[PDB]
């Protein structure tokens, strides 16, 4: 596609806390996260069933990057999402992706036993994006504008 052009969209996440951060991903002095992803957690004592739709009224393809969180303990799972088992479903009119999070203790990286799995979804013009989450959703903040052309990638250590 040859571009990282990102357009922020108005997702409304009612009933959850947004912009979660982690000390394994510092930005500045404080904790942070991926700038293009939005870590949603419980608000108060509840994590509702999120149900958001984002139509594509443009003449190009939208690329959506999203993820699901894999906690390491049941205590981490409930204290973040209340529900003992999360679920993330991202669908269009022609596709669906349902991911059940795994709760396992993995080897420590940057002090963390937990993990995040990244997925993607392309929305053709006229189609709509639907996100349905019971918990563990790392939501998108927008879409990347997709292009066709002569761009590519290369592995090299040669100086420019």
Partner 1 sequence: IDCTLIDALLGDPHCDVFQNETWDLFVERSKAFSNCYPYDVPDYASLRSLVAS
Partner 2 sequence: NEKFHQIEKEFSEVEGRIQDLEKYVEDTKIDLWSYNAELLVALENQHTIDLTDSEMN
Ligand X SMILES: *[C@@H]1O[C@H](CO)[C@@H](O)[C@H](O)[C@H]1NC(C)=O
Q: Which residues contact 78 (CB under 8 A, 6 or more apart)?
A: 84
Segment 67-106, which members bind ligand X (CB under 6 A)? 105
Counting DSSP H helices and E strands in the chain, the numbers are 1, 14
Binding mask 114-153 for a copy of itself (x = CB under 8 A): -------------xx-x-x---------------------
Which tokens is 41 given?
A: 């957690």
Q: Is 130 in the site for partner 1 (CB under 8 A)?
A: no
Q: Which of the choices a copy of itself, partner 1, partner 2, none does residue 128 contact, using the CB cut-off of 5 to 8 A by kind?
A: a copy of itself
Using the Cα atoms of residue 1, residue 4, residue 100 and residue 106 in order, give the sign of their dihedral: positive
Residue with tokens 């699901």: 68
Q: How far is the CB of 18 from ligand X (least distance, A)?
A: 16
Segment 6-25, which members bind ligand X (CB under 6 A)? 6, 8
């Amino acid at each position: 596609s040859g571009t990282l052009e990102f357009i922020t969209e108005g997702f409304t996440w009612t009933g959850v806390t947004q912009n979660g951060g982690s000390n394994a991903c510092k930005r500045g002095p404080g904790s942070g996260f991926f700038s293009r992803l939005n870590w949603l957690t419980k608000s108060g004592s509840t994590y509702p069933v999120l149900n958001v739709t984002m139509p594509n009224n443009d003449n190009f393809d939208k690329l959506y990057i999203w993820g699901v969180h894999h906690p390491s303990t049941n205590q981490e799972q409930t204290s973040l999402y209340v529900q003992a088992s999360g679920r993330v479903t991202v669908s269009t009119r022609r596709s669906q992706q349902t991911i059940i999070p795994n709760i396992e203790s993995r080897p420590w990286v940057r002090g963390l036993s937990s993990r995040i799995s990244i997925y993607w979804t392309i929305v053709k013009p006229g189609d709509v994006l639907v996100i349905n989450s019971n918990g563990n959703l790392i939501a998108p903040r927008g879409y990347f504008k997709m292009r066709t052309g002569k761009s590519s990638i290369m592995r090299s250590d040669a100086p420019i």
